Amino acid sequence: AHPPELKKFMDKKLSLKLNGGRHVQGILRGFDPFMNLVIDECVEMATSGQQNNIGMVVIRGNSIIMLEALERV
């Protein structure tokens, strides 16, 4: 079927690497057929390593180019 087999990764702690050289790290709970993610406890990794905290975020599917686990399935 069309959904990504992302079911494994849920509630484990992800890093993402986003289009345009951006990085965010997250505990995950969402996916839909386009891979639109809903990330929780989401940190923004700025260029300089000055880190922000931000709340729950949606991501557009096409913006992702990798999706990595910081703590295992």
Partner: protein, 83 residues
């Protein structure tokens, strides 16, 4: 439906060791686990080469389909009953 010969060879590739290069220029080298019909791969136990030289090891990774621009499938597959 006519999902042709290449994606079947991708499913055939699973459980081996494949190399996989993304738009940005990062080169991954990892053991495959599953691959979907739009080429979303999961990959395990990777040694990644960065664009500028550096190596790193990784636990597990999932690589969006449209973001790839080759895989290096393991040569023994040339015999496979898809071909």
């Amino acid at each position: 439906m006519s999902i042709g010969v290449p994606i079947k060879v991708l499913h055939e590739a699973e459980g081996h060791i494949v190399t996989c290069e993304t738009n940005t220029g990062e080169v991954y080298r990892g053991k495959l686990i599953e691959a979907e019909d739009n080429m979303n791969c999961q990959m395990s136990n990777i040694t990644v080469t960065y664009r500028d030289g550096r190596v790193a090891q990784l636990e597990q990774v999932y690589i969006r389909g449209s973001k790839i621009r080759f895989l290096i499938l393991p040569d023994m597959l040339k015999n496979a009953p898809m071909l």
